[PDB]
């Protein structure tokens, strides 16, 4: 089956994002410009125990976002198989650096295709300049007091001054 | 809305069930898919340009949205020639990921309105090496289970 029209695809861009980082901002500016709708999905992942509250990191993913006209964010708490139909999605975005995990991405995409054959799996590639930061350093960084305002967004940084002292 | 222009930048010596698969995602998700058929002959491909192209047409004839067309020049300028905004690159569990990230970053420099994007082909067909293709069918080999049939005719014409 096929159309003419546009393609009005509905991308998904799952993540823990504790904290959403700077990484994470330009990989959603991009998908922003390509694409009609982006869904930030956050992921409770109680099994990692995050830092911040999944409420709290929905509210800080979203006033990071909230300039772009195309994205709204999401928590939950379900499979991302399942998540990912409720919210109409039929694209995962996932970021890609030369850092990446390359071995997990790919049982993750495998796997999620099995459980969901389709919805496509879809890389971006962040900005050289981001693409080295890490979430779990900046915990750690900020943890230990020190300027992590270059590797995230300010609201975030203040986020985590607050969360340690 | 606008109709938006991707291209699918390759050597495609010969086009693969492996590309033939990742040509059909890209389909059902974007309004218009080129196939761009590089020269590349420092390469020095089996086939001639216009023969790969002709086969990746052959191809891919049967879907909607699929053009395939040849090209010497830079590719950063022939995206611009083309009115694309994305480049497709298929992303599996061997690729060359220290290439694909020069790849995209020097062209980020050279088109920074072009984005890179990968797609994962599936798993059953992620392994095919268009190499790997043509050194079996030199040798005789039964190549029908990594290309399309019209594919598998050119080689065994050629050998
Ligand atoms: C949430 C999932 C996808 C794990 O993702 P992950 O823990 O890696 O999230 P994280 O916050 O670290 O990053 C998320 C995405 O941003 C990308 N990106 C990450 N870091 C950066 C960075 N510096 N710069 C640019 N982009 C980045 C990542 O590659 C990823 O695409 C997975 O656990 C999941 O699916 N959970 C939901 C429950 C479920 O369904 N579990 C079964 C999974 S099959
Ligand atoms: C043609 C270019 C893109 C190189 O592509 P490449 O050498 O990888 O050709 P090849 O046919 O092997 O594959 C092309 C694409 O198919 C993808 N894909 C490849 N093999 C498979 C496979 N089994 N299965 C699924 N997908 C695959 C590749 O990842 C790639 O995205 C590059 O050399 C180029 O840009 N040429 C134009 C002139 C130019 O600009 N040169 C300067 C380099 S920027
Ligand atoms: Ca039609
Ligand atoms: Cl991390
Ligand atoms: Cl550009
Ligand atoms: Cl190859």
Same mark, same amino acid.
């Given at each position: 089956?096929? #159309?003419? +029209?546009? #393609?009005?695809?509905?991308?998904?861009?799952?993540?823990?994002? @504790?904290?959403?980082?700077?990484? +994470?901002?330009?990989?959603?500016?991009? %998908?922003?410009?390509?694409?009609?709708?982006?869904?930030?999905?956050?992921?409770?992942?109680?099994?990692?125990?995050?830092?911040?509250?999944?409420?709290?990191?929905?509210?800080?993913?979203?006033?990071?976002?909230? +300039?772009?006209?195309?994205?709204?964010?999401?928590?939950?708490?379900?499979?991302?198989?399942?998540?990912?139909?409720?919210?109409?999605?039929?694209? =995962?975005?996932?970021?890609?650096?030369? &850092?990446? @995990? =390359?071995?997990?991405? =790919?049982?993750?995409?495998?796997?999620?295709?099995?459980?969901?054959? @389709?919805?496509?799996?879809?890389?971006?590639?962040?900005?050289?300049?981001?693409?080295?930061?890490?979430?779990?350093? &900046?915990?750690?960084?900020? %943890?230990?007091?020190?300027?992590?305002?270059?590797?995230? #967004?300010?609201?975030?940084?203040?986020?985590?001054?607050?969360?340690?002292?």
């Amino acid at each position: 089956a096929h #159309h003419h +029209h546009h #393609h009005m695809n509905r991308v998904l861009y799952p993540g823990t994002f @504790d904290p959403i980082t700077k990484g +994470h901002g330009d990989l959603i500016e991009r %998908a922003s410009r390509l694409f009609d709708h982006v869904i930030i999905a956050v992921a409770a992942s109680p099994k990692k125990n995050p830092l911040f509250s999944l409420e709290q990191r929905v509210a800080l993913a979203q006033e990071v976002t909230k +300039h772009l006209p195309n994205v709204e964010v999401v928590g939950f708490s379900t499979l991302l198989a399942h998540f990912v139909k409720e919210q109409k999605a039929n694209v =995962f975005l996932r970021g890609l650096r030369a &850092v990446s @995990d =390359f071995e997990y991405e =790919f049982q993750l995409a495998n796997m999620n295709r099995q459980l969901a054959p @389709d919805v496509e799996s879809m890389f971006l590639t962040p900005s050289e300049k981001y693409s080295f930061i890490s979430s779990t350093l &900046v915990r750690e960084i900020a %943890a230990l007091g020190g300027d992590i305002s270059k590797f995230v #967004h300010p609201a975030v940084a203040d986020a985590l001054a607050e969360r340690f002292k």
